[PDB]
Design a protein around this nucleic acid. Sequence first.
DNA 1: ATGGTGACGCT
DNA 2: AGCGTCAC
Length: 430
Amino acid sequence: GPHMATGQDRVVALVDMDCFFVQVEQRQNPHLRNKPCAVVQYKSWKGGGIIAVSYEARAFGVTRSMWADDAKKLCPDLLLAQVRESRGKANLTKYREASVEVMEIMSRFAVIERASIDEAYVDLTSAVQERLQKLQGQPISADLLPSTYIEGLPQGPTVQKEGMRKQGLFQWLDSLQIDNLTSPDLQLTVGAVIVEEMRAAIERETGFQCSAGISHNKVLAKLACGLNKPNRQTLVSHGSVPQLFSQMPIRKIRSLGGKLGASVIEILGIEYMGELTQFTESQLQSHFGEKNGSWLYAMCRGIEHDPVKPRQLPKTIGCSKNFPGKTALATREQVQWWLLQLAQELEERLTKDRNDNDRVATQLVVSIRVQGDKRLSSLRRCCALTRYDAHKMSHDAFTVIKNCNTSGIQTEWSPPLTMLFLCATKFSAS
DNA sequence: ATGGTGACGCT
DNA sequence: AGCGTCAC
Ligand SMILES: Nc1ccn([C@H]2C[C@H](O)[C@@H](COP(=O)(O)NP(=O)(O)OP(=O)(O)O)O2)c(=O)n1
Ligand SMILES: [Mg+2]
Ligand SMILES: [Mg+2]
């Protein structure tokens, strides 16, 4: 009791852009605003692969990974924006640049951890402590939280979404202990006021809307973020965790959406995150390893210690292309031409990175797939990256992979190559 | 024949 | 080092 850590020591937010690549295209092209629309890559094969989908198009059943020809069957008026193609491949520069817009804004508020192209964690603990000193025990108006949901409320003793949101917010604020600066719930609430300001800045300065979660750790903030997406933010308090977890499928928690989470379900015979509380730490460690068992034991109680890492920039800059089915690369000339395309895009991105960010990459990782292997990568080889030169990079890549070629005949490639990937890594200051 | 990414863990 | 998992 008096020695039981409750994992209420930090205020962490996760900001996640709404339908991000679609909003980038809608900002650019006003004709796509407030329409069913999707972003597609590669138009020739079944109208292109959908990679992002506006909320209006989601209502028709359009999803990511669908072919656009198929999505048009569900939504005949779907509008499409296509990813740029340069050097024979999809080029994601525009989305990378839009991501820097958002991340630079967020960084004004707090140090961020870039978790993906469209989301960042924020450790707001310090900012909250400072704002609590100005909010000199004065209560927090609902007007300061105009887009905030308090998960689990309203509860206890209006049939529209906004009415429910407000009732829940009022319950929460009416019970809050504003005179106590160390109250975790108070800290979260001030965290949420800060996130409202951050989200308004993002929208004002970019035109982009986003969702956010506010809780005491990354996993709860991420989970919270998705509860009321789009264009809303969600506060998940420590106290909300038992009910929230009681019906929360295990696969919804970050890192449990794959084989480990499946093994939790299978081995333990459970379905919901809350059901984990019934195992000892040692029991969990015995099935899932020391690190995972300890993490699960705490996480099912709403407790996690993973810090928000101070890192705004990607640690790797990579370029890849798949060559599926019959397009697989079967000649040495093909392999070299495409290694060069990749190397050229990579050179351009690396040169810009070095000018903007005062660093240089030092290692080149070369990864390939051969026809017939059913693993993402078949083979990964590193070499030194000593010059930002596409012909050098492409020549070196070829050098480190050429003995994969089981062909006797000189100019053929066997088995043919279904993927090429160049990744610049091991950055140093410059 | 979603594809083109990116972070991190294990041995 | 090279392989694997998990995810946006
Ligand atoms: N498999 C995936 C997942 C994401 N992305 C890109 C396109 C997305 O717009 C963007 C962000 O991913 P996301 O957050 O998973 N989804 P998105 O922002 O489109 O919609 P929301 O559900 O977040 O509103 O990354 C991708 O290209 N391939
Ligand atoms: Mg998003
Ligand atoms: Mg995201």
